[PDB]
Amino acid sequence: ERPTLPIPDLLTTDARNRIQLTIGAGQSTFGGKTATTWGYNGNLLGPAVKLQRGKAVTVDIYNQLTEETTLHWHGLEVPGEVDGGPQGIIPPGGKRSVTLNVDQPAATCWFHPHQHGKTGRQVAMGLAGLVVIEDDEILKLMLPKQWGIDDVPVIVQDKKFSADGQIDYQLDVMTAAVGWFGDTLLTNGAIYPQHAAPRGWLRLRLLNGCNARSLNFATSDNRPLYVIASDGGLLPEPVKVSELPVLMGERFEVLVEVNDNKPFDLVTLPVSQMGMAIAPFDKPHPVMRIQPIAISASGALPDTLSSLPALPSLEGLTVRKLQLSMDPMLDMMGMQMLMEKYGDQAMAGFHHANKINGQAFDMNKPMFAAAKGQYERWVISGVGDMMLHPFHIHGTQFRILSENGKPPAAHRAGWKDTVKVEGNVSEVLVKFNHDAPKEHAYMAHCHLLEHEDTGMMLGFTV
């Protein structure tokens, strides 16, 4: 009765070493009602671009929208010139080609628009894809590896729709303060899908592709999840968890056991984030149904996944302070609107009003030049402010030293491109191995997209 989990195509290069991505407007059905949606190579979401470490690929990006957009590869360590930040304009009806020389370990990354001031909308409308980066190392592990059967991407996103069927997106005082969130949960575009998985291990590549909703993954019968990777690749070993908090733009890959005749749900648990526990999200919410199939999966859960370097010495490293803030007026007005619409349940558990170091994002004025090839220490503070800011830095995979006032949890102590900042201070160890000049600067920003779109971003050069 549930629709099957849609599986994004795993797209590799053709004879010319090219991948074609068409950005376009189509239609989808939600709850039997049609909406205009945008997608990459289809109506909605996108394919998974498969990359190999050490190899180049050229991506041809045809923008068939009637408005401008950009194409960013979130999690990829590439020069600014192909980063697809807001300076990477692709005119409506035009084409832009980018050559990606992949130089990082195996990981599940993703891609989405980075259009100046409109990224929340373009994502809400449907635009997101995946990136599966492979290397020599990972294939030796014998992980579940059959794409769409025992190795599946799970892109989880919320939307809200108006009475006429259409996606109801707005960037206004309330959303700019608390984020765009909705009442309907999608999994690879589908409402409460089911996925048929063989007996043994199921690998789920989880992406929180929500604009502003943080999620927290668990199983309906509390079977454990074994985390094997974070934003930037494998952990040294599996880390067993009963629940998995995932911030906006974060990825984790987990293994979960599948047994004959015992279906279970992947669920998300209520989070203590402003706006995000309004019913049906005040209770555990299903994400998808796992249907065991009485066929043996070949995949293993290895004792040992890979190696993390020790953290580099802290003495002598440059420190950059990035103070996050939101105009007090934006905050009071936004939270009032939140409380007035939804009341107390909204606490269960403006275009340049959001800033970093007192400055709302200035596309023409990068805030600093970072060293190339040198570890730096970036200290990101949300002190003075009560909103959730998952802070993301372009052009790198860093190590978390402190996450919002604490040492990182085990499954969060490996390769990360996002870090939690919420009323406290975070510190990360970051290195950039590629150039980004002022014309194609790197972004560092909050990934609660409505904050980003209203100033909580800076450009930096390498």
Q: Residue positions in the annotated binding site for Cu cation?
A: 72, 74, 112, 114, 389, 392, 394, 445-447, 451
**Contact, 314 vs 242, CB < 8 A?**
no
146 to 205, contacts with ligand [O] by CB under 6 A? none
Between CA 81 and CA 364 the distance in angstroms is 15
326 touches, from ligand [O], Cu ion, Ag ion, none (C-beta below 5 to 8 Å by class): Ag ion
347 touches, from Cu ion, ligand [O], Ag ion, none (C-beta below 5 to 8 Å by class): Ag ion
Q: Which is nearer to Ag ion, 276 or 333 (CB)?
A: 333
Half-sphere exposure of 152 (CA within 13 A, CB side): 24
Decide if residue 74 touches ligand [O] (CB under 6 A): yes
36 to 75, contacts with Cu ion by CB under 5 A? 74
For 130, list phi and psi in degrees, rounded to 5.
Answer: -115, 165
3-state helix, strand and coil shares in percent for the chain, rounded to the nearest 5: 10, 40, 45
Work out how close the CB of 418 gets to ligand [O] at its nearest, in angstroms, rounded to a whole number.
Answer: 9
Site for Cu ion (CB under 5 A): which residue of 249, 292, 408, 459? 249
Q: Which is nearer to ligand [O], 248 or 348 (CB)?
A: 248
226 to 255, contacts with ligand [O] by CB under 6 A? 249
**Contact, 223 vs 231, CB < 8 A?**
no
- How many CB atoms are closer than 10 A to CB 160? 14
Residue nearest to ligand [O] (CB): 74
Residues 6 or more apart from 328 whose CB is under 8 A from it? none
Residues pairing with 266 in the sheet: 219, 288
365 to 404, contacts with Cu ion by CB under 5 A? 389, 394
- The torsion region of residue 41 among left (phi > 0), alpha (psi -120 to 50) and beta comes to left
List residues forming the annotated binding site.
72, 74, 112, 114, 389, 392, 394, 445-447, 451
Q: Which is nearer to Cu ion, 176 or 305 (CB)?
A: 176
Sheet holding 354-356, edge to edge: 354-356, 319-326, 376-381, 425-430, 399-402
102 to 121, contacts with Cu ion by CB under 5 A? none
- How many CB atoms are closer than 10 A to CB 332? 12
Tokens of 312: 């580099």
Decide if residue 50 touches ligand [O] (CB under 6 A): no
Between CA 329 and CA 317 the distance in angstroms is 37
Q: Which is nearer to ligand [O], 80 or 144 (CB)?
A: 80
451 touches, from Ag ion, ligand [O], Cu ion, none (C-beta below 5 to 8 Å by class): Cu ion
Work out how close the CB of 375 gets to Cu ion at its nearest, in angstroms, rounded to a whole number.
Answer: 20
Helices (H), 179-233: none
Q: Which is nearer to ligand [O], 50 or 74 (CB)?
A: 74
Decide if residue 434 touches ligand [O] (CB under 6 A): no
Work out how close the CB of 200 gets to Cu ion at its nearest, in angstroms, rounded to a whole number.
Answer: 33
Q: Which residue has the tokens 């070949």?
A: 298
251 touches, from ligand [O], Ag ion, Cu ion, none (C-beta below 5 to 8 Å by class): none
Decide if residue 389 touches ligand [O] (CB under 6 A): no
Q: Which is nearer to Ag ion, 347 or 363 (CB)?
A: 347
Between CA 240 and CA 54 the distance in angstroms is 31
For 340, list phi and psi in degrees, rounded to 5.
Answer: -65, -45
Q: Which residue has the tokens 């409109």?
A: 118
Site for Cu ion (CB under 5 A): which residue of 202, 333, 348, 448? 448
Residues pairing with 359 in the sheet: 356
446 touches, from Ag ion, ligand [O], Cu ion, none (C-beta below 5 to 8 Å by class): Cu ion
Instruction: Name the site residues for Cu ion (rule: CB under 5 A).
Output: 74, 249, 389, 394, 443, 446, 448, 451
Instruction: Name the site residues for ligand [O] (rule: CB under 6 A).
Output: 72, 74, 249, 392
